[PDB]
Structure formats: C-alpha cells, structure tokens
Design a protein around this ligand. Structure first.
Ligand SMILES: O[C@H]1[C@H](O)[C@@H](O)[C@H](O)[C@@H](O)[C@H]1O
Length: 304
C-alpha cells in the first residue's frame, strides 16, 4: 500500500480535491546544481546529483530554481555567481516532457533571482520571466494560470505551479503571485501572508544554522505542520543548510546526516501533515537509512 514504490506517479494517486498546500511534497534545494562535476568546486555548491528528469522519476515535485538574467530573453540557472550550465528553458522542457508523461502530476516551480544580471540585460528578471517564459507560446498549457489562490491538485494536475520568490510580479496564478511578492526573512523561521492575505506562508529557511540547530529547526516546523490542517497555510521547510551545518565535510556529507534523521521523525509521525520539505541530494538513499523523499511521499493519507 506504500505510495513511493512508484515515485514517478505518486500524486496521480492522491485526492485531486486536496489543496496543494495540504500535500506533503518533497523538493530539491538548488535543483539544477546537479550539473557540477568538479569534485572540488562541488563541496558546498553541489546540492543534488540527479537531473530534473530523474529527480522527477524519483518523486520530486517542488523544484528550487535559481536564476540570473544573462539576456533580456534568457534566464540562466545559477548558484549565485556560479553558472550551472543550462537555461531556465532546460528545466521547463524536461518538466513539460514529464507532466506530458505523467499528466496527473503537478510541479511547483520556485523561481528566485540568485544573481545580478549581465550588462547587456535591460528588463528586470521578473519582466524577463513574465515576458519570455511564463507568457510564452511553447509553455502555454504547462503553467497554471488559474484564478484560485488555494489551487487544487485537480486544478493544477499537469501544470507547473509558481512558488514565486522574484518579488512583485504581474503574474496572478501560483504562490505569492501578486504585486507585493513574498517577503522572505534572511536565515530564519518566519511567517507571512501571500497572494493578498489569502495564504499564510510559514517557512523554515534558517540556512546558516549549525547542524544540531538546523535539525531542531526543521522538527520545530514539522511539529507545527503536523497539527495544522488549515488549507490556507503553506509550509515550506528547508532541510538544506550552508557549510555542512558546520558539522560536516560536504553538503553531500551533511545531506547524509540530516535526511535520514528527519526521515525517522516523519516516519514516527505516520500519516500526518508535514508540508513541503526541500532537501539537498534528493532521491539519494544510503543502505540502511530511511529516505526523506520516500517518507515524505508515504506520509500522505491518500485513501481511508
Ligand atoms: O543560501 C540560501 C539557501 O539557498 C536558501 O535555500 C535560500 O532560500 C536562500 O535565499 C539562500 O540565501
């Protein structure tokens, strides 16, 4: 009866009546850094080792896309300064390709300008994205354009939904899609209203935390999500941290220690509300250890 035995289609099995906030959804942090292959330059920069398409087969439905405008018509996928060797449009095609395959899955694409734009560039990153990406003919059916604020799965089945960190946007469909974007606190657990007071955003993004204070920070959010069945609260709980949490040698190596541990909690809680977990090294499982993504998936309640 376990849903994650087949990660490619896990959503297609939920109740399309559910709001997407009410859906426990695994995500990858810094989703497109999988292209890094210099082991050295990789110690903190690399956060994933699969590609989008596998992340997807693997069960990942929240992607943390970091972008930089390198052209008025182009958004580069970056990790700060570090160009990650593809274009925004690399992600969108693979995703378009993928929903196209598993049409009853939905993806939440977060889009945050991680770096200043190149000198040629003139249009703002939001401008750049509203114009040449969201409002583009090629991606026309893919982006949820829906009127709703608490979008249902039924509504967004087959659509890339926006979790927008671009700031104020002239886009009206997705999460915090409105003129005042989403205020995000630097390095903190914090709460805000988005999409014009329709939804509350409760985030744990304490990315600077030392390793034990990180872990306590995710558990804290997870203990909030668990006992909150309000549709109008969205939870995004970042399991990723800087510097290995000051406890480890590499983001990979840090990853190896948080995920399994967080996985144990989630599993302890059984079928409860957990919100959206953003993990480094999504879909990587160490022999013996619980898998955070799988547990995320199996924490959902599906059929009575
Ligand atoms: O380095 C951090 C980390 O990538 C977080 O996941 C992101 O939310 C922050 O914006 C960023 O400053």
């Amino acid at each position: 009866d376990s849903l994650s035995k087949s990660p490619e289609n896990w959503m297609s099995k939920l109740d399309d009546g559910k709001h997407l906030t009410e859906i426990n959804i695994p995500g990858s942090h810094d989703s497109g850094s999988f292209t890094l292959k210099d082991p050295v330059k990789s110690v903190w920069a690399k956060t994933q080792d699969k590609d989008y398409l596998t992340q997807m087969k693997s069960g990942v439905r929240f992607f943390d896309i970091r972008g930089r405008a390198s052209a008025d018509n182009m958004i580069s996928v970056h990790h700060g300064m570090v160009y990650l060797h593809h274009e925004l449009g690399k992600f969108l095609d693979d995703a378009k390709y993928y929903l196209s395959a598993y049409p009853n899955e939905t993806i939440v694409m977060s889009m945050k300008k991680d770096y200043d734009s190149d000198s040629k560039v003139t249009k703002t990153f939001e401008e750049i994205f509203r114009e040449y990406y969201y409002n583009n003919p090629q991606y026309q059916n893919l982006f949820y354009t829906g009127s709703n604020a608490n979008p249902t799965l039924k509504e967004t089945k087959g659509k890339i939904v926006l979790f927008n960190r671009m700031g104020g946007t002239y886009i009206k469909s997705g999460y915090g899609a409105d003129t005042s974007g989403i205020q995000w606190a630097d390095n903190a657990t914090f709460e805000t209203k988005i999409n014009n007071g329709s939804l509350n955003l409760k985030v744990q993004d304490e990315y600077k935390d030392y390793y034990d204070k990180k872990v306590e920070a995710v558990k804290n959010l997870l203990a909030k999500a668990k006992t909150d069945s309000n549709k109008d609260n969205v939870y995004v709980n970042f399991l990723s941290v800087a510097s290995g949490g000051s406890a480890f040698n590499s983001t990979y190596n840090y990853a190896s220690h948080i995920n399994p541990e967080i996985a144990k909690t989630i599993k302890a809680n059984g079928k409860a509300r957990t919100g959206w977990l953003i993990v480094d090294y999504a879909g990587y499982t160490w022999p013996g250890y619980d898998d955070i993504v799988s547990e995320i998936i199996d924490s959902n309640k599906l059929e009575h």
